[PDB]
Amino acid sequence: KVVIIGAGFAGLVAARELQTAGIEYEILEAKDRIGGRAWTEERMGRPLELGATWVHWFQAHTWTEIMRYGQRTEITASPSGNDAHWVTDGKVVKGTEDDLDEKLTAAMGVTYEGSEEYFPNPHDPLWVLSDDFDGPAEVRERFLSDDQTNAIDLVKEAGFDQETIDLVDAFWCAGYIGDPYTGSALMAKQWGALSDNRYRVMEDITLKWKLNNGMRSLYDGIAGDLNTDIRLNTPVAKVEHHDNGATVTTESGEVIEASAVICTVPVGALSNIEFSPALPDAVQSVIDDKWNSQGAKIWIKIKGHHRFLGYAPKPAKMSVVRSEYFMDDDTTILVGFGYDNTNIDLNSIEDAQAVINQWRDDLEVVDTTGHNWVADKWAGQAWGTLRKGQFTQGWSLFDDIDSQLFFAGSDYAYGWRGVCVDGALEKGMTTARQVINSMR
């Protein structure tokens, strides 16, 4: 009689948590599959992550599931020591991956600058705005100003040259999965805080270790623990929510009474649902604006075995492209992240060739694939990233929804928010605990 909307990681881990506490639940999932924005799918000859890919043991929630479902030693590092290429002022520069990492390390020093003052506990991201805050008033003022500054402007204002600016532009096109110039720099500062304020650790956590058996080894693991069947192909159309109960209506018109609703539908898809009473205005403002997640992820297959890394600034079709798999038919599969889903067809060989042509003339695309999450009505976004102002007046507003309507999902997590499965596992579990505590 707790209704969980969505069978992504947040909904699945919430259901398992309620099951432990002996609370009845049902998961309603719009699609014919579980996993949500994590999706391991056979494409181009091997299982590919169409959404979530990388993990690390410094991600508490993800790592606990990894060792729980038998994947402790089933991780492999992405290719390193690639030949690096970056576009600066319309020109392609060649260098080593070490050259590029060294430039990004210098830029991150400035990008992280106030993280030690803001985030002594990196899992208390709004401590500076708390009544417990005991630092100088100027730290609070800089904190609020940093929510209105993008991460590239920090590097420009520090006097870095155009080559570094173009590299950081490319880097945050990928990191903010859209337009980095509309983003909040506090997101980047918290990533630093969660990564011991070191670029190499941040990259080790977010872009290095892949699951050999895919994200599906974790979400199928959680689903396999559930004693209540998930209702697939059952989109929720309406949520009524009050002080002591709730009512969910599906698109087919079926009405389901509930003691509480845990809604894991992302902001990009919340407009599909009618809420009664209406969601708070501050929450509605975030839904209208959306997150700063408008980009896309591609998998490109080229002829030959090539150790390749490419960076290119906005408005490139793809801003970061890296070799990931070397296939037996003498081809390489590369992964790419781009800032604008509408400027690339992830399944067009000509478009993928244009991506590769950003850096090389000689490499030939023979296949390409991807899922455009932004054009997917049940997602409407890639991973959640913050526009200006959304660090302090965005993700945290979804907590109180007065009633028995709780929002859970990676996009509302305290820690690795939006960008990581860790945040979905965090917030699905803690939201289930809110429901557990209320009932106890």
Ligand X SMILES: Cc1cc2nc3c(=O)[nH]c(=O)nc-3n(C[C@H](O)[C@H](O)[C@H](O)COP(=O)(O)OP(=O)(O)OC[C@H]3O[C@@H](n4cnc5c(N)ncnc54)[C@H](O)[C@@H]3O)c2cc1C
Ligand Y SMILES: [NH3+]C[C@H](O)c1ccc(O)c(O)c1
C-alpha 397/C-alpha 401 separation (Å) is: 9
Select the binding partner of residue 174 from ligand X, ligand Y, none (C-beta < 5 to 8 A, by kind). ligand Y
C-alpha 370/C-alpha 317 separation (Å) is: 14
Minimum gap (Å) between residue 36 Cβ and ligand X: 2
Judged by CB under 6 A, the stretch of 161-169, 190-198, 373-381, 398-406 that binds ligand X is: 373-381
Q: Is 269 one of the binding residues for ligand X (CB under 6 A)?
A: yes
Of 3, 4, 15, 28, the one binding ligand X (CB under 6 A) is 28
Minimum gap (Å) between residue 160 Cβ and ligand Y: 17
Nearest 5°: the CA angle 345, 165, 350 is: 20
Q: Is 424 one of the binding residues for ligand X (CB under 6 A)?
A: yes
b/e per residue 12-49 (b: at least 16 CB within 10 A): bbbbbbbbeeebebbbbbbbeebbbbbbbeebbeeebb
Q: Is 420 one of the binding residues for ligand X (CB under 6 A)?
A: yes
Select the binding partner of residue 10 from ligand X, ligand Y, none (C-beta < 5 to 8 A, by kind). ligand X
Q: Is 112 one of the binding residues for ligand X (CB under 6 A)?
A: no
C-alpha 113/C-alpha 108 separation (Å) is: 8
Beta bridge partners, 263, equal 5, 407
Minimum gap (Å) between residue 350 Cβ and ligand Y: 24
Q: Is 125 one of the binding residues for ligand X (CB under 6 A)?
A: no
Q: Is 111 one of the binding residues for ligand X (CB under 6 A)?
A: no
Instruction: Give residues with Cβ within 8 angstroms of 241, minimum separation 6.
Output: 261, 275, 276, 277, 401, 402, 403, 404, 405
Minimum gap (Å) between residue 109 Cβ and ligand X: 25
Nearer Cβ to ligand X, position 107 or 296?
296
Select the binding partner of residue 9 from ligand Y, ligand X, none (C-beta < 5 to 8 A, by kind). ligand X
Q: Is 38 one of the binding residues for ligand X (CB under 6 A)?
A: yes
Q: Is 175 one of the binding residues for ligand X (CB under 6 A)?
A: no
Nearer Cβ to ligand X, position 38 or 258?
38
C-alpha 412/C-alpha 426 separation (Å) is: 9
Q: What ranges in 112-267 are assigned the alpha helix state H?
A: 115-118, 137-146, 151-157, 162-175, 185-193, 199-207, 216-225
Minimum gap (Å) between residue 10 Cβ and ligand Y: 17
C-alpha 223/C-alpha 230 separation (Å) is: 8
Of 16, 23, 40, 54, the one binding ligand X (CB under 6 A) is 54
Minimum gap (Å) between residue 15 Cβ and ligand X: 11
Judged by CB under 6 A, the stretch of 116-124, 180-188, 267-275, 319-327 that binds ligand X is: 267-275
Q: Which residues bind ligand Y (CB under 6 A)?
A: 171, 174-175, 206-207, 297, 320, 337, 419
Nearer Cβ to ligand Y, position 25 or 176?
176
H or E segment at 55? strand 54-55
Of 178, 183, 266, 310, the one binding ligand X (CB under 6 A) is 266
C-alpha 59/C-alpha 193 separation (Å) is: 13
Which of these, 100, 115, 117, 346, lies nearest to 203 by C-alpha position? 100
Q: Is 168 one of the binding residues for ligand X (CB under 6 A)?
A: no
Contact 114, 189 (CB under 8 A): yes
Strand order in the sheet with 83-87: 92-96, 83-87, 308-311, 320-327, 331-338, 296-303, 365-369
Q: Which residues contribute to the site for ligand X (CB under 6 A)?
A: 5-11, 28-31, 36-38, 51-54, 235-236, 264-266, 269, 272-273, 297, 373, 378-379, 382-383, 409-410, 420-424
